[PDB]
Amino acid sequence: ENRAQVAARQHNRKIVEQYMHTRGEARLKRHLLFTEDGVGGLWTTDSGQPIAIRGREKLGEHAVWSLQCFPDWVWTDIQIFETQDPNWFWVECRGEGAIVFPGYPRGQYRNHFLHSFRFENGLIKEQREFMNPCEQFRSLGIEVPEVRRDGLPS
Amino acid sequence: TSENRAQVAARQHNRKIVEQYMHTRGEARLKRHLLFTEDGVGGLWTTDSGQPIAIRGREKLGEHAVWSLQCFPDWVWTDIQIFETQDPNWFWVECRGEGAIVFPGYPRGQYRNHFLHSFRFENGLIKEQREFMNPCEQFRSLGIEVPEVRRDGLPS
Numbered sequence A: 001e002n003r004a005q006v007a008a009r010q011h012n013r014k015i016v017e018q019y020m021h022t023r024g025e026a027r028l029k030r031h032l033l034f035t036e037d038g039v040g041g042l043w044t045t046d047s048g049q050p051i052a053i054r055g056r057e058k059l060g061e062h063a064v065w066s067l068q069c070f071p072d073w074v075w076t077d078i079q080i081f082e083t084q085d086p087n088w089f090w091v092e093c094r095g096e097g098a099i100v101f102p103g104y105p106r107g108q109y110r111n112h113f114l115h116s117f118r119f120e121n122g123l124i125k126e127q128r129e130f131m132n133p134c135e136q137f138r139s140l141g142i143e144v145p146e147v148r149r150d151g152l153p154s
Numbered sequence B: 001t002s003e004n005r006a007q008v009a010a011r012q013h014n015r016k017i018v019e020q021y022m023h024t025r026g027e028a029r030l031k032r033h034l035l036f037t038e039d040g041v042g043g044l045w046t047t048d049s050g051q052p053i054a055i056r057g058r059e060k061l062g063e064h065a066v067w068s069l070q071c072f073p074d075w076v077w078t079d080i081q082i083f084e085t086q087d088p089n090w091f092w093v094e095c096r097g098e099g100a101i102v103f104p105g106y107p108r109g110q111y112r113n114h115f116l117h118s119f120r121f122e123n124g125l126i127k128e129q130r131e132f133m134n135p136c137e138q139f140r141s142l143g144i145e146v147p148e149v150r151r152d153g154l155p156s
């Protein structure tokens, strides 16, 4: 069983690496790193509900959109964490690029990210990204509310 | 090997400290800073301003606990999942948290959120703790209006 666990972890790490380094036109094929029922998406949004893209086909369709609205996106400062689960990885990184979001002025978006990758049978079953949406608000020209700190110590 | 045994031992001990931290609640929070190195850092990495709020030093962490017990009087971490990593001195935690929020100048509220924690260790104690959440949920708990990204132009 330890052999099976070890085997899984090394292959899955390569897939996380490939995902995090997928750039440009290659993003159109990134969904091939998922299971047929794989899910990806953004877990931290203004509404408090995740935005999940469900299914390898819908993920492939969505990459076409992502290529237009984040045309030069790169992940940077990539740190991949294996865990005691050979099928679960976490990634700490930054990301940056132009943001061309429908209905908003073209801007530049930079943020810190955490990604969760869960695997099934050698491919990604669930990818989740977590960030501070306040930085995406700023990139879109949306006013960020400020918590009053006057009464706080520091 | 002897080096592998030392890494296993460090990871097992550090996991116990992460567990203790995550289950520390009530008055015990006043002593949670003893789980840190003398120069340890803790705090909140995701805020409205985009800059972390870092509390630097075991002494300052203990002093800050006094404020934390006033403004989050009954905080609980729930749904705790602890992740060891290939670094015996680096752990991640996925969890939820809940409690009253009693922030100066705001109405008393109830705050619920999802959290990720990072714990880095030195010599058996916490050198750096960092907390990551979506601040929009804390805005809601304080009665602060959350801006809405318009979705009309997006694929549905």
Ligand SMILES: O=C(c1cccc(Br)c1)c1c(-c2ccc(O)cc2)sc2cc(O)ccc12
Pocket (backbone or CB within 6 Å): A040, A041, A042, A044, A045, A046, A047, A051, A052, A053, A065, A066, A133, A136, B149, B151, B154, B155, B156
């Ligand atoms: O930036 C995204 C995004 C980008 C790529 C994938 C995913 Br999933 C989400 C956001 C949205 C989105 C939703 C549906 C789409 O088809 C396209 C974009 S809504 C929204 C609200 C926020 O407060 C912050 C970010 C977003």
Ligand SMILES: O=C(c1cccc(Br)c1)c1c(-c2ccc(O)cc2)sc2cc(O)ccc12
Pocket (backbone or CB within 6 Å): A147, A149, A152, A153, A154, B043, B044, B046, B047, B048, B049, B053, B067, B068, B135, B138
């Ligand atoms: O919740 C906290 C917080 C930060 C660090 C430790 C603890 Br405990 C709580 C926030 C603040 C704070 C700052 C300085 C203090 O001394 C006490 C509170 S400001 C702010 C702004 C946000 O948008 C969201 C959260 C906070």
